[PDB]
Structures are given as structure tokens and as C-alpha cells.
Amino acid sequence: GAMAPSYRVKRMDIAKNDEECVVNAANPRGLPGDGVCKAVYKKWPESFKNSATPVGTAKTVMCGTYPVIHAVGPNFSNYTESEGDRELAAAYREVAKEVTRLGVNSVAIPLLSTGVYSGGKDRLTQSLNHLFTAMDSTDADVVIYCRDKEWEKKISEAIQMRT
């Protein structure tokens, strides 16, 4: 574990992370996809061998010795708010199990279902709270990666609020 497990947020490409593993915002089919998923495909294409997995699950594939945890959040275009919320919380619980199993001291993680799977809604708080619910009991340093300054500010505030 990390000596003093923390949360941090950085505004930059998760493909350039400084952590011991990465969480992909994957699609269920292991396709290159869009946004975070396409950046992860460019950086770690070998990790997309048999990475297909259902919504609400995570499947880890090694790129060399670097673990890529493919976490499939729900596409809120297709799910009801209620069912989408359940699957989004489930995907993060599976990430916590994988991070634990791998024995890493740090993990780079995007906010699941906040981009092209958001169904056009702002899900920063929903997604981040499900991330905390899953990851709080883990002792890995968690580094959240986002794109926009206003998201960075809100995520930072939410982390600092808990202390």
C-alpha cells in the first residue's frame, strides 16, 4: 500500500500518468472507442487482447507488466437513471477489487460515464462519489485524470472537503 493513501486530481491525458496502473473508461466490446478509451488504445494497444467485459465490470489486461484495468461504465443514453446509477457504482467496486488484487501502490483513474456515456448530463459528483465509495477502503494512491479546468477545480474541492 501507499504510506499515506491519498486522492489527487490532475488535468492532463491519463495516457501520460505517473501511476503503477491505469483504469480505462472502456466499452463492453474491447473496441478502440473514443476519448479516454482511444488514448488508452494508442498508448497500450496490447491491453485490448480479450478485454471485452460486460457493463458494471472490470477486466485487467497487462501491457508488458503495466496493468490496464478496463472498467465498463453504463452509457446513460441506453440505461434508466436508476439502473445506470447501479451499474456505475458496480464498475467502481470492480475497479477497487482489481487494484487490490494487483497489489499496486497507485492507480490512475478517469471519471466513468462522464463523457460520451453521460447521456449529455453533468455526472461529475455522481461518478466521483461512486469512485470514493469504492476506493476509500483501498490503500492505493488514487490520481484522478480530467480534461477541463472547471472539472479539475470541482474535483479538487471535493477531495479537500473530506480533508
Is 69 in contact with 23 (CB distance < 8 Å)?
yes
Encode 87-132 in three state secondary structure: HHHHHHHHHHHHHHHHCCCEEEEECCCCCCCCCCCCCHHHHHHHHH
Decide if residue 92 touches Cl ion (CB under 5 A): no
- In the annotated binding site, the residues are 13, 27, 35, 115-117
Using the rule CB under 5 A, which residue among 1, 2, 6, 12 binds Cl ion?
12
Decide if residue 145 touches Cl ion (CB under 5 A): no
Nearer to Cl ion, 139 or 148 (CB): 148
Please tell me the distance from the alpha carbon of residue 151 to that of residue 79, in angstroms, as a whole number: 24
3-class state of residue 59 by DSSP: strand
Is 60 in contact with 68 (CB distance < 8 Å)?
yes
Decide if residue 152 touches Cl ion (CB under 5 A): no
Decide if residue 122 touches Cl ion (CB under 5 A): no
Using the rule CB under 5 A, which residue among 44, 48, 92, 117 binds Cl ion?
117
Using the rule CB under 5 A, which residue among 13, 83, 85, 152 binds Cl ion?
13
Is 144 in contact with 131 (CB distance < 8 Å)?
yes
Piece of 98-106, 113-121, 128-136, 147-155 that binds Cl ion (CB under 5 A): 113-121
Contact residues toward Cl ion (CB under 5 A) are 12-13, 115, 117
